[PDB]
Amino acid sequence: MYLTLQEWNARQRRPRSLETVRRWVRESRIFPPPVKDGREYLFHESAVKVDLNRP
Template identity: 50%
Template sequence: MAKLLDLQEWAALVYSQPPSLSTLRRWAREGRIYPCPELHGKKYQLVADAIYVDPRKSKMVRKTTSVSPPKKGSLVEKLKHVEQAGPLQR
């Protein structure tokens, strides 16, 4: 298991000028750090490779190139296209 760091140790590793402890605690409460820090007593503990997640960015997934189905053609051609595309990802 990886060694857990407290918020100030983590911020010192990630930022050249770390935010204040109250800001780090607010980020932990609001879920802005992934993976989510764990509260051990009165201190938040988290793994060293945790990242800050910007809440204004609604989608944090990597964009993939999607192929749109053909607009014209028979039903059989459209079904073949769906089979080649693979399973749907939601």
């Protein structure tokens, strides 16, 4: 089962903007990264945003 860009963001702790979610995908802030299918992205069921930074 693979959720879409909107469906995935509609299940997070706090729904954000479509363009915002698109930014994480480009910043690899989505583990695991979505898969390209057609024109939209397909995220994983247990997909959750992470922070690739160690201050």
